[PDB]
Structure formats: C-alpha cells, structure tokens
Design a protein around this ligand. Structure first.
Ligand SMILES: Nc1ncnc2c1ncn2[C@@H]1O[C@H](CSCC[C@H](N)C(=O)O)[C@@H](O)[C@H]1O
Ligand SMILES: Nc1ncnc2c1ncn2[C@@H]1O[C@H](CSCC[C@H](N)C(=O)O)[C@@H](O)[C@H]1O
Ligand SMILES: Oc1ccc(CCNCc2ccc(O)c(O)c2)cc1
Ligand SMILES: [Mg+2]
Ligand SMILES: [Mg+2]
Lengths: 234, 234
C-alpha cells in the first residue's frame, strides 16, 4: 500500500512457486524454521523474508563448500541466519549484524529451541562500521568462508569492497535481491517508491560492476529475488 | 518442431531472462563456450542446450566444492561438459556418457581449443549399462564428487539409484529440467507431445521421490529449466 514491488515474483506464475515450495522446500524445512517463518509472515515487513526454497539453497551451498565461519549482514527475524546455523557443523561460528535487534528477538526463541544459538555472535549496529573494524583486527587465518548480504540495498557496493578482503580466497559472497522483483531489467521503471527506485538503480550498477570485477567469479541465480554468488579469486 | 514447450520460460518475461544473460552470463562466458553455444543454437535440437546462466551456476558449484572427478550423463554438443572441464583443476577428470557421439563431435573442436579435452573420457553408449559396470568396478577411493544428469528424462529415477552409490558421501548429484518448463506445477497439462507428457509425469514423480529420499539432502533451484541439487548423506 506504500511500496509497489511487494506483490511481484520473478517466476512466470504463483502456481510454479507454490509447487516448488510445497513439493521440495516445506518437506525439507526444519520445524524451527517453519515456526520462525509463520510468525514472520504476520509481521508488517514480511515481504523482506528470505523464502523457503532459497533458504534450502543457502543451506546446500554451505554444506557443499564445508563452511565453518560465516558472516550474515541483515538478519531481520533470522530465517537465513537460523538456516545457516542449522547447516554449519556443531563448532561453526556466525557473525550476525543488523541495526534492529527487535526483529531478531522475534526469531531468537526458535533459534534457541533449535539449539544453535551458541553458534551466533549478534551485533546490533550498522553493517559498515563493523566491517571496517573487522578489517583492522582480521588475521589471515581468521577470514570468513561465506558471507550473506541482505541489508540496506543501496549499500551493497560498499559492503562488497570490505567483503572481498574479509572472505578467504575461494570463499563465497552472496548478494540477495539482485533481480529486485524483475525491475532491474529496464533502464526506466514506473511508479516505484523513492527507496525502491534507489535500490533498483543500485542493483543495476552492482550487477554491471560485479560482472566486470576481476577479484571474483560470479553466478546470478534466478532463485528467490535473485541471488548473486561471488567467489573470491585473489 | 514437434514438441510444444520448447519456447516457454519459467521467468515472468523474456526481458528478465535477457537481462540476466546480457548482464551476468555472456560477459563471463569463456570464448569457447560462446562459440559452442552459437553453433548449437543453429542445430535442430538446440532446445535441450543448457543455458548460459545455468552454466555459470554449475561452474560455481564445482569450484566451491573443489570437485576433482565428475560424471556427466547427457552430453549433446558439450556445453555443460565444457563448462565442467573449464571449472576443474588441470588434473581433474570427467566421465562423459551419451548415446550420440555425433552431437559431441559438433562441440569437440571448441573443447580442444580450450585445451581441456585431456580431462574428458567420452563413452558412446546408453548410460544405464555404463553406470552398472561402474558400480561393479568402483572402489571406495574412486567415487565421484559431482554428477550432472541431463539425458533421457523418463530414466532419471533409474540413474538416481546408481548414482547415489557412485558419488562420494558429501558429493553432489544434479538433475536438469526438474521443473519441465513449469508444466510440472499442475496435475494435468494440455497440448503436449506424448513423450513431453511422459517426461512431465516422470519429473512430478521424481520431485516427490527426491523430497522424501532419506539418502540425500536436496535443493530445487528455479534456474534454467529447474535444477535439483542432491547431496549424498550415506
Ligand atoms: N545499515 C544496516 N546495517 C545492518 N543491517 C541493516 C542496515 N540497514 C538495514 N538493515 C537490516 O537488514 C534487514 C533486511 S531484511 C533481511 C532478511 C533476512 N536475511 C531473512 O532471512 O529473512 C532488516 O532487518 C534491516 O533491519
Ligand atoms: N539412454 C541414454 N544414455 C545416455 N545419453 C542419452 C540417453 N538418451 C538420450 N541421451 C542423450 O542425452 C542428451 C540430452 S541433451 C543434454 C544437453 C547437455 N547437457 C548440454 O549441456 O547442453 C542428448 O544428447 C541425448 O543424445
Ligand atoms: O527501504 C525499502 C526498500 C525496499 C522496499 C520494498 C521491498 N521490501 C524490502 C525488501 C524486500 C525483499 C527483501 O529480500 C529484502 O531484503 C528487503 C521497501 C522499503
Ligand atoms: Mg532479501
Ligand atoms: Mg537439460
């Protein structure tokens, strides 16, 4: 009623997305992930929730690459965070960052019931100052295997400049929402809320930049709202 | 053309697909992959060609899991095979299986000029006999890291029972076309060629079976025509 893109999906039909969720995603969704999702769906910002089919995709990536130490930028109620914590080994460690811990406390009971809260170091701050402080203290043997970026959309390019130094060589950086409900496909797009237009132009610039960035290999994956996987080359 | 689905997209517009390919895939596509794709686009069976954005996704998965030995079932002109060979290290090895070597001869010059043909063992045969002989010969030290299944659609479930024993624990099995142009989303779908309808039902059964299969964790990804990633648990 205030933002324009919230009822749009990138697949050709709602029926196909429902088929995917019902056939493949929900039967593989942890019970605490199911709980966190269903309370979040009643929250006013439920449009920002990472969907269940994308969540299982993040879980698969974490396990295939044997991730141990991860960083999560943009937590909200914690669906992707809890997804990550359940995918990591028992000794896995996550640095979670979000300006608003009130959202996080919506999901924390489910994280606790899942028995994975011990893996999480939550920092209530803006992401950039923490990443900049991490650049001064980071030791080469302390680099992250994996980074999920899902915070302020207009700041992804700034996040990238830090994360290509905070993630190990061969580690992964994942940028959520890089297709922005399909609106990135046109130079001009009508009738968006000013912040949705800022994010749209930001993603158009980020997609072009990442495609030309020699520090990484990339794969833009038309899952959820678009996820761009980056792999650090040096 | 006899098939009915060949031109249907699973994204909501051609413009979105073309944005992804033009922005994120084509600029990252190896020169020999581009040449192979262009020749194949002129072939009568170009519909079955793995698309460029999915190719980068397959390549990203291989590198993040540091795959070294792979199997490829369903080669055609070799786009995904070349993709796999370019991702592997210099001493990587691939077993490629297809019933029609003449398709493979179309892309072979591009594979050779990429300098990666030495990694490929091409077997001109039906996949099931080869897979069965592989299970009779395979030692635990020889198990594959990664398997890409993209051959006779109605036989995926049969391939699956062999491949869950031929990929290592923690190894990945990927099935192509698991969304089948979106037509899997409904119990019935009018206007299909008979063997288009057989594949559709075979994928509907396959997707339900894979979601319940305790031997693997899965992730169905709405990229290309749908890719289902399986990871062997035991
Ligand atoms: N500058 C900033 N630094 C850190 N977090 C920020 C931020 N600006 C916005 N955010 C947070 O980023 C989140 C985006 S919604 C994130 C969704 C979440 N990944 C999921 O799994 O569902 C919001 O919770 C918002 O509070
Ligand atoms: N029983 C069988 N065993 C092995 N290959 C088969 C087969 N039946 C069909 N095929 C082959 O499977 C291929 C499917 S098209 C595969 C496309 C390819 N993966 C790409 O990257 O473009 C065809 O080449 C067909 O010849
Ligand atoms: O300042 C904004 C930016 C965008 C909107 C519209 C969509 N709401 C944000 C959103 C949507 C999906 C996500 O995945 C995500 O992280 C966030 C509203 C206010
Ligand atoms: Mg998001
Ligand atoms: Mg295919």
């Amino acid at each position: 009623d205030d933002y324009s893109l919230v009822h749009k999906n990138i697949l050709h039909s709602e029926d196909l997305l429902k088929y995917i969720l019902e056939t493949s995603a929900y039967p593989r969704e942890h019970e605490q992930l199911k709980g966190l999702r269903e309370v979040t769906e009643k929250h006013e910002w439920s449009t920002a929730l990472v969907p269940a089919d994308e969540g299982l995709f993040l879980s698969m990536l974490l396990k295939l690459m044997n991730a141990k130490r991860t960083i999560e930028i943009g937590v909200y109620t914690g669906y992707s965070l809890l997804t990550t914590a359940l995918a990591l080994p028992e000794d896995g460690k996550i640095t979670a960052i979000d300006v608003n811990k009130s959202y996080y406390e919506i999901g924390l009971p489910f994280i606790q019931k899942a028995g994975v809260e011990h893996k999480i170091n939550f920092i209530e701050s803006e992401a950039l100052p923490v990443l900049d402080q991490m650049l001064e203290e980071m030791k080469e043997e302390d680099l992250y295997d994996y980074a999920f970026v899902d915070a302020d959309k207009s700041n992804y390019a700034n996040y990238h400049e830090r994360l290509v130094k905070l993630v190990r060589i061969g580690g992964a950086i994942l940028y959520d929402n890089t297709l922005w409900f399909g609106s990135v496909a046109y130079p001009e797009y009508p009738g968006l809320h000013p912040e949705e237009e800022v994010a749209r132009l930001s993603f158009r610039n980020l997609n072009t930049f990442l495609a030309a960035d020699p520090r990484v290999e990339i794969s833009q994956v038309s899952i959820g709202d678009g996820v761009t996987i980056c792999r650090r080359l040096y």
